[PDB]
From Swiss-Prot, chains A, B:
InterPro entries for the chain: AGAO-like_N2, Cu_Am_Ox_Cu-bd, Cu_Am_ox_TPQ-bd, Cu_amine_oxidase, Cu_amine_oxidase_C, Cu_amine_oxidase_C_sf, Cu_amine_oxidase_N-reg
Disulfide bonds: 309-335
Swiss-Prot/TrEMBL cofactor(s): Cu cation; L-topaquinone
Function: Catalyzes the oxidative deamination of phenylethylamine to phenylacetaldehyde with the concomitant production of hydrogen peroxide and ammonia.
EC number(s) from the headed UniProt entry: 1.4.3.21
Domain of life (superkingdom): Bacteria
Record protein name field: Phenylethylamine oxidase
One Pfam family linked to the record: Cu_amine_oxid
2',4',5'-topaquinone, modified sites: 374
Amino acid sequence: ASPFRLASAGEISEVQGILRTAGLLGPEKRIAYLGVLDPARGAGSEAEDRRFRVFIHDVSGARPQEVTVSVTNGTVISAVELDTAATGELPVLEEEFEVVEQLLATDERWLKALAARNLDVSKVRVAPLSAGVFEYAEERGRRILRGLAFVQDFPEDSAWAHPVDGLVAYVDVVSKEVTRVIDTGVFPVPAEHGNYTDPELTGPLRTTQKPISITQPEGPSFTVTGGNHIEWEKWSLDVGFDVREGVVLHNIAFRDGDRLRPIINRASIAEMVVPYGDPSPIRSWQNYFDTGEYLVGQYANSLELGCDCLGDITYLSPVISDAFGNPREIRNGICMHEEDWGILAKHSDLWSGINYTRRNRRMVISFFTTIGNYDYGFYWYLYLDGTIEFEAKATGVVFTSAFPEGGSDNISQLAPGLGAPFHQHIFSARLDMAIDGFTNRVEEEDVVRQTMGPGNERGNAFSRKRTVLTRESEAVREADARTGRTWIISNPESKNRLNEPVGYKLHAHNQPTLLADPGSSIARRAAFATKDLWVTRYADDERYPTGDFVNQHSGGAGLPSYIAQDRDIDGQDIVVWHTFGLTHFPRVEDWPIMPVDTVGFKLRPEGFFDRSPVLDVPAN
Amino acid sequence: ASPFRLASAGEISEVQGILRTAGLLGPEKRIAYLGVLDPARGAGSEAEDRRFRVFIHDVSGARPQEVTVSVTNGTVISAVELDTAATGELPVLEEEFEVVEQLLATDERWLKALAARNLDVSKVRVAPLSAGVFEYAEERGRRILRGLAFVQDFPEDSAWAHPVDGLVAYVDVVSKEVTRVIDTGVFPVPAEHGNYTDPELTGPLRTTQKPISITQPEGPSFTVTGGNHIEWEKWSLDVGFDVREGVVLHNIAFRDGDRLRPIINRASIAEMVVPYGDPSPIRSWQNYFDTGEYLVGQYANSLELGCDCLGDITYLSPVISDAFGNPREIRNGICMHEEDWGILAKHSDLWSGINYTRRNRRMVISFFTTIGNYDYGFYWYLYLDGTIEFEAKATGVVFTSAFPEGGSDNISQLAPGLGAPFHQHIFSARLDMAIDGFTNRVEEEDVVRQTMGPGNERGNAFSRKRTVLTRESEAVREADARTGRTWIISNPESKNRLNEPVGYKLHAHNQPTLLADPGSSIARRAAFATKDLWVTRYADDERYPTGDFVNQHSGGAGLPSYIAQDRDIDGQDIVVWHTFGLTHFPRVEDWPIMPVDTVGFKLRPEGFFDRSPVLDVPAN
Ligand SMILES: [Cu+2]
Ligand SMILES: [Cu+2]
């Protein structure tokens, strides 16, 4: 009965039927995006209205449409024709990926480029990537994909080891014709192979690892009801899934005594951009908006037990729509389980003679996606003490290029002649706050050093200060690790027993933000990535930091636009957008396949409770 | 036969016998410190010389001595009389702690202070803490301890909940007389109790936690030989133990192919300071050099299986000396085990059809200590990919005070009338580097943003720069999280297959450093804590960032002194000293007992290997 339940295959099929009956889904139509809409603010109206949002692409070249349908009433709420040249192109279709390598295969320019490198076109794989927005007015309003080539010697060969530098093509996946083929010069195609399952490269496999068995004889401590509602050690939440955002957490709340206290209404990774810092024209335009342009959700892997998720795992198999509106299940796409987390609290008191120790635990909810050469793991954690944390794990194969003779200031060498362009992996976590309700505010907290003198004769004192962000125009903040800067989200109308507003403190990792030049194209399309923290007044249509249509969009939309409204955020329904990411200068150790590197953030209770909330945990 | 083996009870007894035979350990003598000396540089001389270093205190008031003995030859290498007024007092003796509360109990000033607060002296506990160095020339050359009072209503009561503010006493533990008793005014003694095992405060214990079983049917994957030599997944090291530094790691090396490659010769936490930022005269002098003044090693807890260390644990029981030279075993003071660490590497390749996933694991070596109200956990981790990491875990009971009426800028309120002074927990990790040998150098690496224009027309490029620290005078560095600053330790004479110097990159958490005023007493005694990274030329007598005798020492000694030598560190035997810590503004959630908070650092291989070093890990 929950309005936050996962989408069923039946709802998808019904959306398909609704669109068909309305004439919005003929033979030439394709579903580029489909997701369930969250319940509007104020459920004072019983009986929810299950609504779905759809982006309908037309393979005939006609204009796409944004449609909202009510599966409950079997109707089309609204349908709007879209002008992609203005608002942006729809997410790339999977079927549009295969066409690039296929079309190029019979293009004389492409063939001439390959022949000049003595490469057999049958062995040339083409990575189809987003074109972005540059000095090609020809692409205005067109769905163009740029292709970079990699040689695959045999069917099981890792093409990434054999990049074909100095070459790039542009293809119109709708009119199905190659628009341009650029050849800046031949580069030696790296010869070493990167086959990590090849005995000649791995050498004898280790036989030194003894098994580690993790089990739960009485089953997990968490309950799952309504298909996706989780109850665990006082925590309460609904696990949602969106094809674009991936796993989304709804109604995060904590049972404090006899009352369920909300903390976060909605938590998701609203965007992920991977900007490359190599000035070569072959890759200077390279920027992946995995969440926005490719929809990381639709590439979620089916996680295997014992391999991807170890221990007593409870799976969720979210359903999504295919290009035609048919439901497609992602079997075991989501893992949920609890794991031990060392010591929670400990104290051996000499005076009382009491020796006390308690173990910690965390509830884990995750999924893993694959985008071409990269593989990203998204993990949400809930701890016994009230801490909420997110962790992104980056692995896969590094995107390669040729390593220029004479070195490079923007590329690393991984193998002889093999380069790995510098780049970043930047995420934006959209946190729709609800600290004890929707009346929230954000304070920036800095440590404050004090001068030795009157009132501080010994010069040992230090303090802290808090600045309330009252309007959106003043809510675009940057990190300051040196002064231990954090941001506290509080409810000015809800106080703890000490008469203090309850709150949660966000602790960032303070990693570098977008490095690109402020006037670059990526700096504008990914403006959110230029700052660590943004706070906006909640709005129904403000979902992504980059807007609804990132694919080939001029820029500025998203956060910079929203903030312009300069709305009141001091004790209002607000949203925190936290930018965090990895700056990657590939090492030899990342080749041929890279070890996991991580980045994230967490929020800890700050005077939210009246005392430690884990005093009732048993001795185990 | 290993020169790095743990000390045996027999060696301690022999040190005792040697000192006795030499007349250095009569009835009035006490061992304030005793540790085994590491083998001198160059073991070209077979047959090691097991030497021990001892600080001998005299309860009669005579001068203490620093003595070096050779247990191998049964001789006194050297014995030097110490002038504590100049070089500093010896570590505080445990027997000197009980005398403070005992002496004060019969002092009229103390009794008058207690009577004014209507407190029964039999219920008043006194926390004996280091006096430091301030405007009390009377203390010059004297072993003085300052005492703060806490009320303990009953034998099992938590005194920390009942601080007695406005009162402090100074005691000479040698002449055994109270030097001073300061009373700045009565403060209400917080009444609420902080008994976390009391059903009225904990409420009904949870019954929702199902067990999590972690086992290893075939035993651990690591081997222990020579009592403390560890071999695990290519890693090789010796686990040492010092009463002052706690767990020390020796000869950290990695088996790369058929050669054992050294990385770190010696890794330890050489110092830990806890500076309080409350300007009240009652606590302004409060600074704990747990490692230096109290010797965290001697307070190591005996870790219980299933409680402190879960899973298949292999224990070490280091032996230390008591005040008389008798060996005392710390049963199960060190836990060692391996634990699963999620995904190591993963990639699902569309083109090759190969789906690859591998699990990660970490070797864990830890111990836990208790210092009055605090409990600190020290954890060293070795990962499959070559990463080395340290993690400090802080818990226990927060040091309390009265919460002033009208608020405070340097104290938090935990309960009605109960305050928790602001403070920091700062550590210094001493890393005696040996990246592929002793010829090392350190480079500071910063990300480098590039301006849009010639050679970067799209403004997407970004780079990095490295600056070699050539002399100690230029090796005192600070963090810069904004430019992703890290430090690379490399061997200029040892290159990887790509002709690049091998190295390891240190990743700091970039937390705030010492906040105290630059001219404060703590800023000088803990000068190391004012900067994130120091690099020194290795020397036999440069062991701690604060010198050998921190207790009541003027300051400046340690790192600031060493650096003054301005020695060559560009391709030499060098030591990295990394300052890192927690800045603590106590929250209500930390009371009555605090949940664990953590801080640390790690070092990752940087072109150390010729490719990923975990390609030989099996599919599990
Ligand atoms: Cu990367
Ligand atoms: Cu603390």
